[PDB]
Amino acid sequence: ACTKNAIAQTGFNKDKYFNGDVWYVTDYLDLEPDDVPKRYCAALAAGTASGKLKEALYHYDPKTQDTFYDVSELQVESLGKYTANFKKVDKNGNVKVAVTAGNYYTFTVMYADDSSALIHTCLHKGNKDLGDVYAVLNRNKDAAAGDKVKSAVSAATLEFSKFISTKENNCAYDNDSLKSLLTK
Numbered sequence: 001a002c003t004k005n006a007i008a009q010t011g012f013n014k015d016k017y018f019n020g021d022v023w024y025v026t027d028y029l030d031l032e033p034d035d036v037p038k039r040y041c042a043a044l045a046a047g048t049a050s051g052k053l054k055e056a057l058y059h060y061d062p063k064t065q066d067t068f069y070d071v072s073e074l075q076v077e078s079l080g081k082y083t084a085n086f087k088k089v090d091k092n093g094n095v096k097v098a099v100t101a102g103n104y105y106t107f108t109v110m111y112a113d114d115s116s117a118l119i120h121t122c123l124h125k126g127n128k129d130l131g132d133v134y135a136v137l138n139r140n141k142d143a144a145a146g147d148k149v150k151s152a153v154s155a156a157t158l159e160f161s162k163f164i165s166t167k168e169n170n171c172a173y174d175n176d177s178l179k180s181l182l183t184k
């Protein structure tokens with residue numbers, strides 16, 4: 001179960017975050033650590049498409065090869081805090097698993113600047129969830145976490161030393177698919 005009410009960044013700049021570009025997960029922390037693998041690749045695009053607030057997600061387990069994309073429509077709870085449906089799609093946006101009420105994630109932007117961010121998500125897939133997940137994001141897939149984002153981790157009363165890096169997994173991303181999926 002999820003246990004955290006993540007606080008959104010004071011003065012969050014929504015248009016900069018949701019600009020249509022890609023964010024890579026460089027480091028992650030699940031508060032129920034066994035809920036997810038120890039080696040992971042994830043990225044997202046976030047933007048407004050024809051007036052609608054959207055995210056496109058990519059997950060890849062570098063050991064099993066399990067791969068999936070999702071297209072999400074975000075509803076606003078407050079500035080920087082969203083509830084997202086999700087539909088599982090192929091990389092071209094064709095629906096594999098349709099939207100359904102019980103399949104949603106919350107998404108809170110705790111810190112962001114032009115290059116880096118700290119987010120919280122709580123996934124619900126039916127009666128289950130995947131624990132609280134925190135993710136450090138960067139615009140550059142290879143960037144080590146800098147002082148702005150590490151300080152934000154501290155300000156959330158978390159320890160960056162506990163976060164697991166994605167950098168040693170040979171992660172390769174289809175940026176074109178993530179951008180195009182925003183429209184789907």
Ligand code: HEM
Pocket residue numbers: 025027028035036037040041042044055057059068069070086087088097104105107121123125130133135
């Ligand atoms: C690097 C950090 C992350 C890890 C380790 C991770 C891990 C996972 C895993 C293992 C699943 C599959 C659960 C299952 O078997 O059903 C999953 C599903 C999912 N995750 Fe994450 N995830 C991460 C980041 C994110 C982020 C940032 C978001 C939200 C923006 C997110 C949203 C989702 C969604 C929506 C699903 C369900 C997809 C579907 O069934 O269509 N994940 N994640």
